[PDB]
Amino acid sequence: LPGDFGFDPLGLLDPVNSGGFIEPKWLQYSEVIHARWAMLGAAGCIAPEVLGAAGLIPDATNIKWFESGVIPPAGSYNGYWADPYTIFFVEIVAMQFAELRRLQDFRYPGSMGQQYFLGLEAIFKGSGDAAYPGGPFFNLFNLGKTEAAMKELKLKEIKNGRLAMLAMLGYGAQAVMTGKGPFQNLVEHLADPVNNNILTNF
C-alpha cells in the first residue's frame, strides 16, 4: 500500500487467481526486506572510502569494499582475528536462527512467542503483520504517534529503500567498469564533469 504510484506496467499485484509466491502479501514483504538491506549495504559499501579519505582511520583499513575478502580473486585482506571460514561458520548459524524464526512467524502468525525462549518471546509476538511487528524492541521508541505520521514514515522508508537499491546497483556497475572506488568515481567526476565520465571511460 505505501509508496504506490499506480505504476505496475507489468501488472503482477493482481490479487485474483494468485498463489505460490506470487501474492501481494509476500511480494511487498520481499520489497521492504530488500529496501532495508540495500540501505544498509549502501551505507557500508561507502563508509570506509570516505572514512579514510578524511584520514580519520588508519590506512591499514579502508581498502575498497570488494577486496575485504568476499571475493579473494578480487583481492583479500587479512588481520581479522580469525579465518574467513571460521567467521563464515558462526555467520551461518546466527543467520539461520534469525531468518528461520522470522519465517516461522510469517507462516504461523503469532506462533513464535510461545515455546519457552528464555523470556525472549513477548517481543516476538509483535503485530500480526510481517515486516512490521513493532513491539518493544522492533519499535523501540513509540514511533507513529499520529497514524498520519506513521503512514508518512512508511512512505519515507520505502522511498529511501528504493533509492538504496538503485545506489547499490550503481556501485556494482561502476566498480566493475571503471574498477576504481565509488568515492574515487565521485572525486573524478567532480574534477572533470566532462573528462571524468563514462563517455571518457569508453
Partner 1 sequence: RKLWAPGVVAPEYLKGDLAGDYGWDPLGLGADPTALKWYRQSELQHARWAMLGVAGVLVQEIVKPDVYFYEAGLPQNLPEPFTNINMGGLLAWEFILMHWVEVRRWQDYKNFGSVNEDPIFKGNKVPNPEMGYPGGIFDPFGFSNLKELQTKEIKNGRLAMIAYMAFILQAQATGKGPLAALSAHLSNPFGNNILKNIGTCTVPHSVDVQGLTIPLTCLWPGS
Partner 2 sequence: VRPVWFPGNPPPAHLDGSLAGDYGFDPLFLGQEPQTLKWYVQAELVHGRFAMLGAAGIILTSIGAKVGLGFPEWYDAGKVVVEKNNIDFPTLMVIQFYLMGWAETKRWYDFKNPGSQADGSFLGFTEEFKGLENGYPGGRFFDPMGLSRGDAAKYQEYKQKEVKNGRLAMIACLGFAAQYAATGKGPLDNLADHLADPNHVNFATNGVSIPI
Q: Using CB under 6 A as the criterion, which residues of the chain lie in contact with ligand CLA when the complex forms?
A: 19-22, 36, 39, 51, 56-58, 60-61, 79, 127, 132-134, 138-139, 143-144, 153-154, 156-157, 160
Distance, in Å, from the CA atom of 135 to the CA atom of 117, rounded to the nearest integer, reads: 16
Binding mask 64-83 for partner 1 (x = CB under 8 A): ----------------xx--
Among candidate residues 129, 154, 160, 152, the one with its CA nearest the CA of residue 36:
160
SS3 22: strand
Complete DSSP assignment for 42-102: HHHHHHHHHHHHTT-S-TTS---GGGSSSSGGG------SS-HHHHHHHHHHHHHHHHHHH
Q: Which is nearer to ligand CLA, 17 or 176 (CB)?
A: 17
120 sits near partner 1 (criterion: CB under 8 A)? yes
136 sits near partner 1 (criterion: CB under 8 A)? yes
55 sits near partner 1 (criterion: CB under 8 A)? no
Distance, in Å, from the CA atom of 65 to the CA atom of 49, rounded to the nearest integer, reads: 8
By CB under 8 A, name the binding residues for partner 2: 81-83, 85-86, 89, 101, 104-105, 107-108, 111-112, 114-117
By CB under 8 A, name the binding residues for partner 1: 56, 58, 80-81, 119-120, 122-123, 136-137, 140-142, 145
